[PDB]
Amino acid sequence: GPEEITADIPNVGEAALSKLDESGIVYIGAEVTGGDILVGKVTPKVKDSSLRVPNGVSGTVIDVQVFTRDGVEKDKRA
Amino acid sequence: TEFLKPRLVDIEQVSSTHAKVTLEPLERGFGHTLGNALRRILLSSMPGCAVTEVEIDGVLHEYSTKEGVQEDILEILLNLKGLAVRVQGKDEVILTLNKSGIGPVTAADITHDGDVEIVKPQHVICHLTDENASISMRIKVQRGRGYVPASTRIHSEEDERPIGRLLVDACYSPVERIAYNVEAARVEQRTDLDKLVIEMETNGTIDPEEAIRRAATILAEQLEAFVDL
Amino acid sequence: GVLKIVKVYLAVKRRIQPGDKMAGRHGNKGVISKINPIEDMPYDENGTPV
C-alpha cells in the first residue's frame, strides 16, 4: 500500500505531533532537535515511516518545496 | 599596625561613558594588590542590564526577510545586542519601537518610559526604505551578570517558545575596559605612600563609584570566607 | 515508484569550541583549545587585552 503524509502518526507523542501541522508537516520557522518529526509519512501494516531530525543535531527550520508526479493531488501547504 | 585606610578620594566623569577614579592613601604594594583584584572583579562580577528578546510584526525566524527595509532580520539582532539601556528599580521590562515611512531609525524612537533609561538615543537601528514601510517590534530586558548563550537559555526555561519570538545571547557586563595606575602622592608629608588611579569605559548603564564600591563589597564576601576555618 | 516529494532545509548557527581548526594565511594552521575569562588574558598598559 502506497505512502501518504499525515498527522495521524501511530503511537508517537503529542509534543512532536504539535510541532507538525495538520498536514503532517512541520511549520516554517520552527525550532527542532534530534528525533523531532519533520515529515509525517506513514506506511500501512499502519506504521511511522516518517522522517525525523538526525540524532545529535539541533536547528531551525526554513523551507518547504513540494513536488508530485502527474496525476497527484496537492495539500494546503504546497 | 601602621596601616592608613585608603578611600575613594575623587571621582571623575571625564566622559558621559568613560570615567576616572582614584584611591588614596595606599600602603606599599597594596595598590598593585588591590588594582589587580579590583580589575579582575569588575570585569567578571559587575551586574548588568541587557536585552534578550525580539517580538516582530510577522517574521517567523532570524533568517526571514522584511518588506521595505535596508537590512535583513539577523543584522537587526546584532544591532539590538549592541544596544544597551539602564532600568530603574526593575528586574525586567518590555520595550517597543514603531516607525513608518522612509527613514533611518535610532534608539530614541523607542517607546521610552521614565523608569527606563537609554544610554545612547543616537544608537543606530535599522532603516525603513518605503513610504508604506513600517516596523513595530517588542523587546524585553533582563538584569544579569556575565554572559549566556541563547541555546542554553531556552533549554533551562524548557517552556514552549512560540514562533515569532527570537533568541539572542546575553552580554550583561555594563563595562568592558580597565586601566589602573599606581602613583606616589603626598600623605603624611612623606614618601612611601601610594596613590591609585582607575579608569574605564562603559555603556553608561552604571555609576562608576557604585561600580567600585559594589565590587569591593562583593570581594569582601569571598574574603570573609577565609575566617570560616 | 514515488509520486510526491518534499524538501526541507534546516539552519544551524555555530560558535567556536575547543578543537576547531584555525589557520593564518602564512601557513600557520592550528587548533584552538581554550576559552578564558577575559580577565586572564595578558593586557597592555593601555588596558587592552589581546
Curated annotation (Swiss-Prot), chain A:
Post-translational modification: Acetylated on several lysine residues in the presence of glucose.
Coiled-coil annotated residue ranges, if any: none
Industrial or biotech use: Co-administration of salinamide and rifampicin or salinamide and myxopyronin suppresses the emergence of resistance to both antibiotics.
Complex formation: The RNAP catalytic core consists of 2 alpha, 1 beta, 1 beta' and 1 omega subunit. When a sigma factor is associated with the core the holoenzyme is formed, which can initiate transcription. The rRNA transcription and antitermination complex (rrnTAC) consists of RNAP, NusA, NusB, NusE (rpsJ), NusG, SubB, ribosomal protein S4, DNA and precursor rRNA; S4 is more flexible than other subunits. In pull-down experiments interacts with CedA. (Microbial infection) Interacts (via flap domain) with Escherichia phage lambda antitermination protein Q; this interaction renders bacterial RNAP resistant to transcription pausing and allows it to read through termination signals.
Family: Belongs to the RNA polymerase beta chain family.
Function description: DNA-dependent RNA polymerase (RNAP) catalyzes the transcription of DNA into RNA using the four ribonucleoside triphosphates as substrates.
The protein's name: DNA-directed RNA polymerase subunit beta
Lineage of source species: Bacteria, Pseudomonadati, Pseudomonadota, Gammaproteobacteria, Enterobacterales
From Swiss-Prot, chain B:
Cellular component GO terms, alphabetical: cytoplasm; cytosol; cytosolic DNA-directed RNA polymerase complex; membrane; transcription elongation factor complex
EC category name: transferase
Reactions accelerated catalytically: RNA(n) + a ribonucleoside 5'-triphosphate = RNA(n+1) + diphosphate
GO biological process, one term: cellular response to cell envelope stress
Protein purpose: DNA-dependent RNA polymerase (RNAP) catalyzes the transcription of DNA into RNA using the four ribonucleoside triphosphates as substrates. This subunit plays an important role in subunit assembly since its dimerization is the first step in the sequential assembly of subunits to form the holoenzyme. Part of the processive rRNA transcription and antitermination complex (rrnTAC). The complex forms an RNA-chaperone ring around the RNA exit tunnel of RNAP. It supports rapid transcription and antitermination of rRNA operons, cotranscriptional rRNA folding, and annealing of distal rRNA regions to allow correct ribosome biogenesis.
Entry domain remark: The N-terminal domain is essential for RNAP assembly and basal transcription, whereas the C-terminal domain is involved in interaction with transcriptional regulators (such as CRP) and with upstream promoter elements.
Name of the protein: DNA-directed RNA polymerase subunit alpha
Biological source species: Escherichia coli (strain K12)
